[PDB]
Amino acid sequence: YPNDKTAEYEKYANYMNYLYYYQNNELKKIDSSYFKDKYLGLFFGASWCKYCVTFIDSLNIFKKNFPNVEIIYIPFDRTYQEYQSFLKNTNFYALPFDNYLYICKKYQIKNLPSFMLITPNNNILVKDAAQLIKTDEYINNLKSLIKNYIIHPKTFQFNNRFFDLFRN
Amino acid sequence: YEKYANYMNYLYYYQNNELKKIDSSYFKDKYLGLFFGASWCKYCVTFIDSLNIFKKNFPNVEIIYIPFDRTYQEYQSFLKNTNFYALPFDNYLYICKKYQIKNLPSFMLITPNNNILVKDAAQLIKTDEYINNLKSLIKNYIIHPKTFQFNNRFFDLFRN
Amino acid sequence: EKYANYMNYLYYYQNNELKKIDSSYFKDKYLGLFFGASWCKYCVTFIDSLNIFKKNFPNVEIIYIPFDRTYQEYQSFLKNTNFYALPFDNYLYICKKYQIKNLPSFMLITPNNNILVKDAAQLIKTDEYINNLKSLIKNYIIHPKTFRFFDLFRN
Amino acid sequence: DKTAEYEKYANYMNYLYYYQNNELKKIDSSYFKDKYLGLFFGASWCKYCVTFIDSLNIFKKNFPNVEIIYIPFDRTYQEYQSFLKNTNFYALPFDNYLYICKKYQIKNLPSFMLITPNNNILVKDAAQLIKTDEYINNLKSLIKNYIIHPKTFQFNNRFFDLFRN
């Protein structure tokens, strides 16, 4: 009751209200509610890291086999210029350009690239999916994992899935 | 054929400094942890402590050693310092090919119906942070029963 | 041309105060560049291997290249370690130069800024490496160079 | 009786193998005296080792006198042959080389190790090194600057020393 800082906390209800993507030469926004109830693939990467650039071929093959999983780029670029040139050469959504070490701390991400597969209720279906997707042996078994894994509904703070996923 | 019908009909273990065998049908309907390793590889020997802590946390998962020892005597000395089950001493590169196993140790978590629950579990179980995530995977993954060729889940799991 | 301004001091904690050292102290020394962060548990567990490395190679100066998110996290790291550190800043440009893609990473650098061991973090986790590294140090001819951190981190 | 068997190892690894014209050829191991070597631990059934060949070809272009030797972990002679025909590397004869993995604690395929003429390890984890563009000038400096102190190999057999603890 004393020293209630709900007022301060409430700013976070609009955290990550948009993701970004390229269409022709436009950096466009998409309302993050679009990702409600979707499986996500979180791609931790940077345009300056050659391994992350070669990894895009594996992600593109993954996307062809798992078209309903949405790929979200979590950038570790140095400038907007680097971020924008990379995003325009991909079919991915992205977090806005920013410093995301706090997400690395939450999931103990220690390598670029890293790729994690996330269920609609923000559980981790595959922690180390970057390794998983560089051969093609994974496809049938990942389809079984997605088909068979029960999704128990959760309540996200402020009804904000990305606040839950990246902060809580 | 004939030894298709008898492929992997027993797994092996040590007890009281004696090599023993168990009907492999005992592993029907069990979660398995396939431990790819070798006694010559120091990273595999230290990994035994992570597996033992894993087993304490997940006691219904059966740990099966898939050996890459050079000699039967090295295999035996390794198996006697563990309480794991093991495939018979043999050359298992065909299993490495099937699953694209490229590192020792590797550890794969398998459901009762031979699906892969966690492909790269060695790195998962050396941390502190995996228990609740793995508990949820096991509790949430629906098991549809399967019948296996030659009535032998290891024929399916290792040879298709 | 304030390249003269670049990396004039490294930092460290001693007697619970933040101190600085002129970067010319590191001229002609073997260096161990430790890319790390206090938020990364694997970097924190790696400090024990670095301390054992330092006991066996006391003349190699370990330099911490930070990837902490905040200045307070960086200071807490310095208070708990015995390395010299770059000032708190964003060092992705060094990661790009050397294609550092993992934390921790550890690189061993000769007095004239050549790379003696590119991927030394896995090397020093064991203690199998010690004789091999002693031979590399003993046998690597040094051709002296006039300048060191602008050459090492930018070129 | 078998102190004579121990002497047999003076002829250990007397030939390496390679393919030139879909044709299997042998080369006297003495060709490799005083050479730097790149030991490539790999297997044709391992997709990561197949993709690694691209990095080894860039390495061979930039370091043509570092002789690449394939240490096989193929299941069958035919897998070994097909791999060798497509990479025209030198190779140990098809066999089981777990004892080499024990000596050097090789735990990943592919692995690649750079060896000096006196059998010291110049770069232990060279598979990681050569996947980047950046390594070339500093590896040339490392080869140019590392002093080679002469050693005596048992039976004057370099590969016996390099592979057999």
Residue numbers in the entry:
A (entry chain A): 12 to 179
B (entry chain D): 20 to 179
C (entry chain C): 21 to 167, 172 to 179
D (entry chain B): 15 to 179
Give the text the authors published on this PDB structure.
Plasmoredoxin is a 22 ​kDa thiol–disulfide oxidoreductase involved in cellular redox regulatory processes and antioxidant defense. The structure reveals that plasmoredoxin, unique for malarial parasites, forms a new subgroup of thioredoxin-like proteins together with tryparedoxin, unique for kinetoplastids. The PfPlrx monomer (12–179 aa) contains a twisted seven-stranded, mixed β-sheet (β1, β2, β5, β4, β3, β6, β7), surrounded by five α-helices (α2 to α5). The longest helix (α2) in the PfPlrx structure comprises five turns with the typical thioredoxin active site motive WCXXC (W59, C60, K61, Y62, C63) at its N-terminal end.
We have obtained monoclinic (space group P21) and hexagonal crystals (space group P61) of PfPlrx from P. falciparum, both diffracted to 1.6 ​Å. The asymmetric unit of the monoclinic and hexagonal crystal types contained four and one monomers of PfPlrx, respectively. Finally, we combined single anomalous dispersion and molecular replacement methods to solve the monoclinic structure (Adams et al., 2010). Manually rebuilding and subsequent refinement resulted in a PfPlrx model, comprising residues 12 to 179. All structures are in the reduced form, with an equal distance (3.8 ​Å) between the Sγ-atoms of the active site cysteines (C60, C63). The four monomers (A, C, B, D) in the asymmetric unit of monoclinic crystals form two types of dimers: Dimer AC and Dimer AD (not shown). It is worth mentioning that only one (AC) of the three dimers contains cysteine residues (C60, C60′, C115, C115′) at the interface. The active site residues (W59, C60, K61), helix α4 residues (112–117), loop residues 120–123 and R89 form the dimer interface. There are four lysine residues (K61, K116, K117, K121) and one arginine residue (R89) at the interface, but they do not form polar bonds between the subunits. We have crystallized PfPlrx in its reduced form so that none of the cysteine residues at the interface, C60 and C115, and C60′ and C115′ of the adjacent subunit form a disulfide.
